[PDB]
Amino acid sequence: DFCAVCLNGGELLCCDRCPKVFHLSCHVPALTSFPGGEWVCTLCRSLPGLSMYDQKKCEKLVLSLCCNNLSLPFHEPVSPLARHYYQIIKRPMDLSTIRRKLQKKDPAHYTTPEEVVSDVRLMFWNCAKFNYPDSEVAEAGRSLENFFEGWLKEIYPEKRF
Ligand SMILES: [Zn+2]
Ligand SMILES: [Zn+2]
């Protein structure tokens, strides 16, 4: 009943192989039209810039982040009006920036999975550098990073990073 990424209702696409449902633009990659049917989400699929193999793996990683309820504070960039944020944080990073750079036409498209992982960790580092350690946001960032580091060993057991 609820999009797995933004937790809002409306016109939702169901994945056949898992309970998850998505707004078309909340899925990764975003869909621009509905499918006829028998559709499976990026998490349940099989198989310059990223190789097609790494593209799908990094899409699984980024969608796992977006679908986890702890990622909500990190879905969009911080408002540049936000007091002191852009003075402390010289390299802001957020999941809408990561999503966009996963698109192969993007002029800053990722070329290696290490680049994707470096941005994710940059996001967690900025969170802990700016937010009060007992803020709700800082707690969500620490807990989400533990999820991410676990998925990394699951999706790329071989790579060191
Ligand atoms: Zn959504
Ligand atoms: Zn699924």
Residue numbers in the entry: 971 to 1017, 1040 to 1153
Reproduce text from the manuscript describing this model.
Herein, we determine the crystal structure of the TRIM66 PHD-Bromodomain in its free state and in a complex with the N terminus of histone H3. Our results show that the PHD domain of TRIM66 recognizes both unmodified H3R2 and H3K4 residues, whereas the Bromodomain interacts with the H3K56ac peptide through its ZA and BC loops.
The 2.1 Å crystal structure of the TRIM66 PHD-Bromodomain showed that the PHD domain adopted a typical cross-braced topology, whereas the Bromodomain adopted a typical left-handed four-helical bundle topology. There was an extensive interface between the PHD and Bromodomain, enabling the formation of a unified structural unit. The results showed that the H3K56ac peptide interacted with the ZA and BC loops of the TRIM66 Bromodomain. One asparagine on the BC loop (N1123 in TRIM66) was conserved and played critical roles in recognizing acetyl-lysine.
